[PDB]
RNA sequence: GUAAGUUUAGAUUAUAGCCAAAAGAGGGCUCUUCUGGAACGGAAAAAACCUUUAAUAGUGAAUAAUUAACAACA
């Protein structure tokens, strides 16, 4: 039930750096793992929608927290 | 990369399966048609699943119901003997 | 009234970008594609034709 | 019911974050087909060859000529007739004797 | 005849709202520019081609460090449409001989003097 | 009728359906329970083959034990030598998978490989397009290569 | 998984039968769905040389 | 001489793919019925029963 | 800000251009003057318009230009 732009973009916002070549391998050869990634991308999309509609200071989504490096 | 029955030749796989299930005191399986496509054409696909006590043990694909049903038997046997495709890789790590 | 309407249009226009600013400041190097008269006329005149809605 | 995808067809997705927040854990067990959703095998009346012979029934003119035979074949397999014609010796001698095999 | 042009001086006199938007105090001006070429010099007049070579901006998307002094600024105005300018920033101070080998420039414009490639925690 | 009420019409509501996310407090408890179960599965060793996605050279490879990989440059490793691949982005099994953000921790996963062959590529023809091309205005490119065999993938119960 | 080689290949490349209902629909939007399945672009194993189409029935 | 030592006698020609696996799948290869929900009594669409 | 410039010695070839964009002059041509161009991407095909610092291997990645645009009252 996902369009291509939504799927790819939201995975990036979760700090997942799999490339297109390897993603095709999982879909063909790892159907259950691909489904798990599908839910993750969908959830992050929903969190973004909630943050957009709700305005002001509100707690950020569980999966919308970005790990930092230095 | 070698499948079990490629190295061992077994005819009538269902007959062997029935005896093996008896040893562990399990009821004989019930064959049923889980999925179907293009039955009336010349290229049909069949999925047959062996159900035990209303619980699924194996599922197999085939061109014809008889072929698909026989395929389900081999899938079941492999799981019983633990020679599945996704089994633990052999271990050459040991230096001893 | 026409002159008064013209003044009103300039003051209340909501477009941040106008022909005059870009031409005079040579943003994009736009002057490569323009004539000297464009700076004077400010895009309200093209050939012999007058544009009544250009602001 | 935290998973945003229905769990009824392929697998059950359970997604969790570790305490440190550096790893994502996925639990996906398989879903088996319910017994109530299956049909009985039609035991009363099968090799695929027998199916083909019934489909490719030779009724008139004994073995048919090329053209009529090809029209019968195209209907059975849902193709056009052009597929079934042969080729000349130039193309047949170019074909590889032993093409490579992967696994 | 297409020729070199002179920009009116008013363009470079800022407004109070601009200071808020871009966040630069009209006092304590920054010292070093970061400049990158983001367009091409083909189909442009020869004076612009020469200046780009003077400023070292031959390769696109590679930053160059320059002084924020009037003589340099006069040249930058000529090629303003082909470049991007960002002020330099040194949160942790200028690099010393000890830290010279551990600097790294961020996209924000900050020259950090320690780079460990580890989570901040 | 409350203020700001619009009767139902075709355009009254947006086409999409708004959803309600689960509350944070309960979700965190469920997250901890899920992690506990998976760690027990690792601890008891209830898994078969494992497959990992490893970033090596400049490329990403889906990998499993006994697999063969070809790297298109020299490596400086002798033949028959064992190595450890240190950038792993995903490890998976039949029932569970682990994802790094963007990389997994060193403790969790260890992948080892061996150098099998060091070779060169077959000749590749490069012939630029130019007026008066000619058949001798041609170059042959051959690059060095190396082959690695993946040996093992291991996990530990430290989630 | 754990199938034999030939049944595994047969299952993956099998051709499916679909049904569409056209009452009150616009013909253009119906075509988009039908074209997608006829070419086989709904399968992750799609390739232009693999002949992976499906049957579509419209009423 | 060192190059000859490292080589295996296999022919140096075009190699179709960089990667070779004999066990490509752990969870099972994709077929059209994966990701399709079943139905009660196994009723194909519009079958009355 | 930046790395060229003059003098000495030797040497040919070339001496008809084309299109786009400005300003004029004889009234669509015809001259004079300043700027730009010669894709393997784009504008439908596309010397001259737009994006483009050289050229190498790879089953990696981020981007640029990008023929379409949403009949009354007031």
Swiss-Prot record, chain A:
Location of this chain's protein in the cell: Mitochondrion
Residues in coiled coil: none
Domain of life: Eukaryota
Similarity remark: Belongs to the bacterial ribosomal protein bL20 family.
Subunit structure: Component of the mitochondrial ribosome large subunit (39S) which comprises a 16S rRNA and about 50 distinct proteins. Interacts with OXA1L.
Name this protein carries in UniProt: Large ribosomal subunit protein bL20m
Organism of provenance: Mus musculus (Mouse)
Gene name for this UniProt entry: Mrpl20
Residues included from the entire protein: 80 to 149 of 149
Swiss-Prot record, chain C:
Transmembrane segments: none
Superkingdom as given in the UniProt entry: Eukaryota
Cell location: Mitochondrion
Family, as annotated: Belongs to the universal ribosomal protein uL16 family.
Record note on quaternary structure: Component of the mitochondrial ribosome large subunit (39S) which comprises a 16S rRNA and about 50 distinct proteins.
Protein name (record): Large ribosomal subunit protein uL16m
Organism: Mus musculus (Mouse)
Biological classification of the source: Eukaryota, Metazoa, Chordata, Craniata, Vertebrata
Gene expressing this chain: Mrpl16
Swiss-Prot record, chain E:
Subcellular location: Mitochondrion
Gene Ontology BP annotations: mitochondrial translation
GO cellular component: mitochondrial inner membrane; mitochondrial large ribosomal subunit; mitochondrial ribosome; mitochondrion
MF terms (GO), sorted A to Z: structural constituent of ribosome
Keywords: Mitochondrion, Ribonucleoprotein, Ribosomal protein, Transit peptide
Segment forming the signal sequence: none
Main location: mitochondrion
Disulfide partners: none
Region ranges (Disordered): 10-30
Subunit structure: Component of the mitochondrial ribosome large subunit (39S) which comprises a 16S rRNA and about 50 distinct proteins.
Protein's UniProt name: Large ribosomal subunit protein uL30m
Provenance organism: Mus musculus
Gene name for this UniProt entry: Mrpl30
UniProtKB/Swiss-Prot annotation, chain F:
Keywords, sorted A to Z: Mitochondrion, Ribonucleoprotein, Ribosomal protein, Transit peptide
GO molecular function: RNA binding; structural constituent of ribosome
Disulfide cysteine pairs (residue numbers): none
Main location: mitochondrion
One GO process term, biological-process aspect: mitochondrial translation
GO CC term (a single one): mitochondrial inner membrane
Record localization: Mitochondrion
Protein family per UniProt: Belongs to the bacterial ribosomal protein bL21 family.
Subunit and partners: Component of the mitochondrial ribosome large subunit (39S) which comprises a 16S rRNA and about 50 distinct proteins.
Name of the molecule in the record: Large ribosomal subunit protein bL21m
Organism of this sequence: Mus musculus (Mouse)
Gene: Mrpl21
Residues included from the entire protein: 50 to 208 of 209
